[PDB]
Amino acid sequence: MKYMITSKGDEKSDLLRLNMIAGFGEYDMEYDDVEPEIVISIGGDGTFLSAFHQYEERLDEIAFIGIHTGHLGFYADWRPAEADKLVKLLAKGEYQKVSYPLLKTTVKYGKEATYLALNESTVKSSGGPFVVDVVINDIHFERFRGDGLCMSTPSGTTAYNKSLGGALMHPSIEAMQLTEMASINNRVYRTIGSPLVFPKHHVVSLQPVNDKDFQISVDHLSILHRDVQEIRYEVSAKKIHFARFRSFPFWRRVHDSFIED
Amino acid sequence: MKYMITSKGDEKSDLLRLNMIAGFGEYDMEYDDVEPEIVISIGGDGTFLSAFHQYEERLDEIAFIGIHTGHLGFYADWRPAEADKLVKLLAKGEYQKVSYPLLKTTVKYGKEATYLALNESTVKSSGGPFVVDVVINDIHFERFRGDGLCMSTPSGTTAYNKSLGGALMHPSIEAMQLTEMASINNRVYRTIGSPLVFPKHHVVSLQPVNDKDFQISVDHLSILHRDVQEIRYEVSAKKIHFARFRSFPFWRRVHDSFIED
Amino acid sequence: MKYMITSKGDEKSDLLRLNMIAGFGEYDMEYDDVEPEIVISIGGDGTFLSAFHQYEERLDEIAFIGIHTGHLGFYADWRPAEADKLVKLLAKGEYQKVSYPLLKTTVKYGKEATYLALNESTVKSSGGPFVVDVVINDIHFERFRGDGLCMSTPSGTTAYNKSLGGALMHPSIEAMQLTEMASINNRVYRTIGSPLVFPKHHVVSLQPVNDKDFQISVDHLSILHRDVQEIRYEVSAKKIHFARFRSFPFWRRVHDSFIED
Amino acid sequence: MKYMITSKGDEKSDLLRLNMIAGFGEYDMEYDDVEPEIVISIGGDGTFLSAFHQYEERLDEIAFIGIHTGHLGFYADWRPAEADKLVKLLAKGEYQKVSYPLLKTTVKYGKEATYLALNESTVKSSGGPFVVDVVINDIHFERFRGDGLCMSTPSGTTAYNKSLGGALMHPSIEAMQLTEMASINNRVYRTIGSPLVFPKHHVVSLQPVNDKDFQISVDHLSILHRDVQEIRYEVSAKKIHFARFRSFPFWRRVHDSFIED
Numbered sequence A, B, C, D: 001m002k003y004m005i006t007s008k009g010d011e012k013s014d015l016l017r018l019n020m021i022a023g024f025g026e027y028d029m030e031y032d033d034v035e036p037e038i039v040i041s042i043g044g045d046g047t048f049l050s051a052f053h054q055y056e057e058r059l060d061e062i063a064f065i066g067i068h069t070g071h072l073g074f075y076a077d078w079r080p081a082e083a084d085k086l087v088k089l090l091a092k093g094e095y096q097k098v099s100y101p102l103l104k105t106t107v108k109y110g111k112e113a114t115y116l117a118l119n120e121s122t123v124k125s126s127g128g129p130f131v132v133d134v135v136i137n138d139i140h141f142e143r144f145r146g147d148g149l150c151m152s153t154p155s156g157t158t159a160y161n162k163s164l165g166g167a168l169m170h171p172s173i174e175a176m177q178l179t180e181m182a183s184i185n186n187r188v189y190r191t192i193g194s195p196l197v198f199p200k201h202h203v204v205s206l207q208p209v210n211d212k213d214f215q216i217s218v219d220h221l222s223i224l225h226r227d228v229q230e231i232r233y234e235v236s237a238k239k240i241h242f243a244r245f246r247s248f249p250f251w252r253r254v255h256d257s258f259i260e261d
């Protein structure tokens, strides 16, 4: 149906995009970057993340496909050489949609902003020490002191979460995972020191203790927030949908990205 | 209805057990340790684990309650001082049952044994180096070399799993978590180096590479298995049921066991 | 001889400082904050670090003493209640000096700045991804990608180094320790993934790969450096000297700060 | 002078050994496996460790050389293809000896055994839970509960130590490093949770708390010790000497074994 293609913008990805557009022109496929139903991202995982955020208001109407023109990017299902086969399979249709969970971040001030993450949302201080009270379902759980906190989706667990020692979670699990960045632990300061995995409908709230200014990232996007009263995390009701044309199981995707390929 | 009480066996737990039996005698409660419907464990988490295994064939007919006579044992909901209040609340009934997921381990030979775990199942070598191929849903994922592997239930994630760097998982999540014990990683040997969290219906199979003898633990119970062809892990269809008389959320239980109490 | 006293500046530390100055006035002790031979820091480890940096040009002429007015600060040897005993012991003299190793950081541009650290020197990016080549004694060792790097002195190993998973090193060992902050490791990116401990006379050089702007911290002090060609680390030839009046072994100091007190 | 050659015993290593013996026969080199001055190990690091232990009573009279016939074994300096060049260089002599530190383990009973380690000494329980008091220079430092403890030499820090999260230490540093295996940490049980690095002349003593039977390994060799009163660790006064014919710096050796080669 209606589709669009985003490109990383180097010569290789732009040319692949032009060639796929020409192939789509041989079928009943209209290029429409306002209301696409298929969004193809040609590049790396950053390109894919940007495509997701370009269309985060129409996630229920869109299925995503990623082509990696660099290394195997984690959200990519296709190598450039297979682009023509993808054009054909997509043109016919009847593919199967797979959905991954997303993370909702709410930032309250003294007003309210919400963000959606496909990989993770992180919070750090705007310069001074980072100290927050971590409140789970209204239960005061710990006072965190350290460099920051990372809350990850299942598909994000192989990203920043992994570098911070988090568990890799299969994306059929509707959960979010909280990991610590360089927590201090001594006689007077104590944190849990393990990643925490939360189900859908649990709410994790971070509440400032002294400083109220924080640097909050959502996927690639980092923003300074001033005068914050609360940062709230929960599994979103929204999901991202992928078009799948063949089996590529998550654990094989993990194997291919981290073990050998 | 029918109940029984297991005790750690020290003077404090035996006397509490005798006093609770006397209190139950004032209600319509028959002591029956063949077909109980309520199993009370008085001791620590080891006592509770032994009670679970004493009745693992009647898990669908039983609700468990733990009293800790030492430190706050993780599966315990009651301190000894509250025993009389428990007798009363239990006598009336109408309490709410909560269920935690369990782990099924299958060991195949050259014959087949199955075990059920509430905390975890671990595998180590019987003396020589431990090397196994890890196969996930028939996908060859890694060759593990190291000291051993631990597969944990959600409620077990605060136990051995935690010491091995695993994530703590809320027990409403029907999953199991695989953690590494001292994996070797160099130019020639590679493992994933993160805990892995698996949903229900995924099967993780360990397949021997050289040595076929393994020491397999299920909760406290360690057994030498010889001539092993495969060890298979999956989330069990069986669940353990707890009798709950008041709110004691898992994350508060974690707070009280690890942060402060 | 000549001494001075720095204070954290709260009411408790200022009053202790005034009372110690009055006690010193009863001996042959001149207050001199230009050329002291004894520097007393009253506060926490931050106060002590600031005192060290206030006098880093006269380290060979100075012995430091720390009083902690908060929790046991790691560099502190005295509680406030013992201040009068310290005045007396110090007045007589004949105490023993103990020396800890220090870290030299050199930052080269396209010009050169040097810094001395008692705890550690860290490097992060000024916004974009952090990528540096790590060169040890002119040997290209790894390309580091992640959040940053921390180089610690022995006495700093219980500070930020510890939170990053580094080893605690006894300060009689003339060494520095490099730890990673959230390194990425996948099929294409590889780091050593262990802390590294370097002897005196080894030089660790960080060399930019793309971005040349870095945020470099030395103890509490964080500075944006632009147009960096190289950051070089080595154990300094300079040492910090403490006045010791009684045994307080490093491993007891560690026990008291992290295990119980 | 007098030399001997140990072989892993596969066809490749036995033939290399025979060919080197024939080459040595063309010089003033006597084969003597009672009092060698050069010990050549042909195989892997296990072969090298066995050669070290075969001659641990004559370490001051011996220089070791390792040839790896498998992967780059860490203690190996030569590939098989260079064997003839080694014969020649060794025949002439005038090579430089390099020394690495060693670890002394003393096991006291209710009698005394001492062992020397090139990689590490580990202690685990003989079946039950492992609990020991850790005493550093007669200072009670922690009660360790977990799977076991590993004490490593500098050259051993890239071995089991590395898998347990220890730091890699340059072998010019006369030290030993203690790492934890799966320590338990909760409200009631506390360990330091970081590797500890000890200088020469510090003594680390492990003292049993309940069970007195332990499985103690020294390099590859694992032994059940019963009725143990104390296990004591210290940097040995003895050193192992390597014959070096060219530069192969430790950090390049680490790079080649863990980063790429």
Ligand SMILES: CN(CC#Cc1nc2c(N)ncnc2n1[C@@H]1O[C@H](CNS(=O)(=O)N(C)C)[C@@H](O)[C@H]1O)C[C@H]1O[C@@H](n2cnc3c(N)ncnc32)[C@H](O)[C@@H]1O
Pocket (backbone or CB within 6 Å): A044, A045, A046, A049, A072, A073, A074, A119, A120, A155, A156, A157, A158, A159, A160, A161, A163, A219, A220, A257, C129, C145, C146, C147, C181, C182, C183, C184, C186
């Ligand atoms: C620009 N990034 C796009 C992405 C991605 C991604 N998504 C997954 C995925 N879901 N699964 C597996 N691989 C995944 N990638 C891979 O991550 C590498 C990213 N490049 S980078 O980190 O060097 N960089 C900052 C340039 C690259 O290989 C890419 O294919 C943002 C993301 O970086 C992540 N990030 C930030 N700081 C990090 C840290 N210190 N360690 C590890 N990740 C870190 C964070 O998650 C953010 O959303």
Ligand SMILES: CN(CC#Cc1nc2c(N)ncnc2n1[C@@H]1O[C@H](CNS(=O)(=O)N(C)C)[C@@H](O)[C@H]1O)C[C@H]1O[C@@H](n2cnc3c(N)ncnc32)[C@H](O)[C@@H]1O
Pocket (backbone or CB within 6 Å): B044, B045, B046, B049, B072, B073, B074, B119, B120, B155, B156, B157, B158, B159, B160, B161, B163, B219, B220, B257, D129, D145, D146, D147, D181, D182, D183, D184, D186
């Ligand atoms: C006899 N154990 C009973 C239990 C339990 C338990 N269950 C949870 C829970 N679900 N949540 C939180 N606390 C939990 N406990 C607490 O664990 C301490 C156990 N005593 S012990 O490990 O010292 N020991 C071996 C005497 C004690 O406080 C108890 O209340 C067996 C279990 O030990 C575990 N175990 C074995 N080796 C371990 C390692 N190296 N590190 C950590 N745990 C280890 C393994 O899980 C096994 O099933």
Ligand SMILES: CN(CC#Cc1nc2c(N)ncnc2n1[C@@H]1O[C@H](CNS(=O)(=O)N(C)C)[C@@H](O)[C@H]1O)C[C@H]1O[C@@H](n2cnc3c(N)ncnc32)[C@H](O)[C@@H]1O
Pocket (backbone or CB within 6 Å): A129, A145, A146, A147, A181, A182, A183, A184, A186, C044, C045, C046, C049, C072, C073, C074, C119, C120, C155, C156, C157, C158, C159, C160, C161, C163, C219, C220, C257
């Ligand atoms: C203001 N700091 C002074 C100090 C110190 C110190 N020196 C040692 C020592 N040698 N041994 C043991 N305790 C030590 N302290 C203790 O560290 C706590 C510091 N307060 S703080 O980190 O919360 N903060 C930023 C307000 C406090 O208890 C103090 O007594 C700077 C230092 O923070 C360190 N730092 C920065 N980020 C950190 C992270 N994420 N985790 C851990 N440390 C971190 C870094 O080393 C810097 O030099």
Ligand SMILES: CN(CC#Cc1nc2c(N)ncnc2n1[C@@H]1O[C@H](CNS(=O)(=O)N(C)C)[C@@H](O)[C@H]1O)C[C@H]1O[C@@H](n2cnc3c(N)ncnc32)[C@H](O)[C@@H]1O
Pocket (backbone or CB within 6 Å): B129, B145, B146, B147, B181, B182, B183, B184, B186, D044, D045, D046, D049, D072, D073, D074, D119, D120, D155, D156, D157, D158, D159, D160, D161, D163, D219, D220, D257
């Ligand atoms: C038979 N080993 C000989 C050796 C060695 C060695 N010495 C160093 C060195 N100094 N530097 C870098 N590489 C090093 N090797 C490499 O270690 C691999 C060993 N094979 S093995 O561990 O699979 N095995 C048990 C068959 C192999 O590549 C070899 O070249 C005993 C040693 O294994 C170590 N060991 C035991 N359990 C371990 C764990 N869980 N993780 C990691 N190491 C473990 C322990 O140190 C013991 O002394």
